[PDB]
């Protein structure tokens with residue numbers, strides 16, 4: 232039911248310029264940010280420490296502080312031996328289940344190249360071959376391999392468990408959708424648009440209706456985020472001139488207590 | 497290099513004269529370096545807040561820009577994006593018909 236993702240973004244412009252920024256997400260709720268120009272990790276929730284003690288948190292952040300400086304030095308040295316600008320991304324974390332699976336994926340120039348897998352680093356089908364040498368040498372780093380394994384196997388699920396308890400009231404908030412209608416011309420024929428905004432959590436039901444008859448032609452757009460941690464979504468329907476009369480947008484959402492929004496065109 | 501997609505939408509039902517919030521959601525780009533301006537009548541809006549840069553399963557970056565605005569019968573609102581994948585800044589105008 233929940234994915235916890237740490238997202239690292241590292242840019243290397245030249246020998247003397249680089250930066251690293253990361254963000255952390257529990258479902259669709261940012262819980263941390265770590266700006267390059269920050270010594271420390273910032274909480275973007277009241278509960279972003281989870282159930283960890285201050286001491287456990289400090290220790291864990293130190294570990295990340297060492298890794299941040301280390302990682303920068305390692306890539307910079309690696310390029311100096313074995314083509315700019317360099318973009319590296321890391322996506323690590325774990326997927327929780329009702330009673331978890333952890334991951335560490337690495338991309339390079341926006342191409343997924345390396346993963347942690349069990350006890351070691353692997354280059355991924357069709358990664359650059361020169362990557363095998365530095366990855367083998369890195370697999371010789373027992374200390375790193377041990378820390379990574381603990382982070383993924385133990386630290387992540389345990390920490391996320393605490394988050395889930397700690398952020399109960401944010402994770403389970405209900406914010407009601409608001410809906411409105413518009414339509415749009417075509418090259419030919421109109422398109423009905425149902426705007427649905429401000430709902431939380433993400434799952435939602437939105438359909439153009441004619442009475443109780445679903446207009447299966449209803450096309451749901453992408454979920455677009457609002458800036459207050461609610462979601463925006465359009466559901467649209469092509470119609471012929473004349474056809475609009477009698478149509479309605481119906482929205483169902485857990486926040487509504489079974490009182491669906493119905494808006495008749 | 498991946499080309500930015502820009503979607504501009506309002507937080508609340510747009511109603512002429514009523515303070516609202518305009519969202520500019522830029523997705524699908526790479527590398528992460530980008531410049532985003534929100535515009536009113538082609539002029540730079542000053543107090544634009546932005547989310548932290550993040551990325552998707554496909555590794556491509558996204559960010560949310562947003563600003564306070566008031567829809568009217570005479571003002572144009574726009575989101576302009578400068579990115580290395582395009583020779584020219586791309587502008588998408590908010591259209592409430594959407």
Ligand SMILES: *[C@@H]1O[C@H](CO)[C@@H](O[C@@H]2O[C@H](CO)[C@@H](O)[C@H](O)[C@H]2NC(C)=O)[C@H](O)[C@H]1NC(C)=O
Nearest residue numbers: 333348349350351376377379380381383384385
């Ligand atoms: C972390 O979990 C991984 C599995 O994700 C463990 O690696 C496996 O360990 C078993 C049991 O010893 C081996 O038989 C497998 O060959 C390993 N799997 C892979 C994919 O290599 C790892 O040992 C765990 N580490 C810690 C520190 O708990």
Ligand SMILES: CCCCCCCCCCCCCCCC(=O)O
Nearest residue numbers: 237239253255265323324382387390
């Ligand atoms: C490393 C893989 C799983 C991570 C488990 C970490 C447990 C707590 C996460 C707190 C957020 C730390 C963010 C650091 C990410 C980074 O800067 O690369």
Ligand SMILES: *[C@@H]1O[C@H](CO)[C@@H](O)[C@H](O)[C@H]1NC(C)=O
Nearest residue numbers: 248249250251267268269270
């Ligand atoms: C990122 O952080 C380190 C230390 O804060 C600094 O030396 C480096 O120049 C920073 N990168 C940028 C782009 O400022």
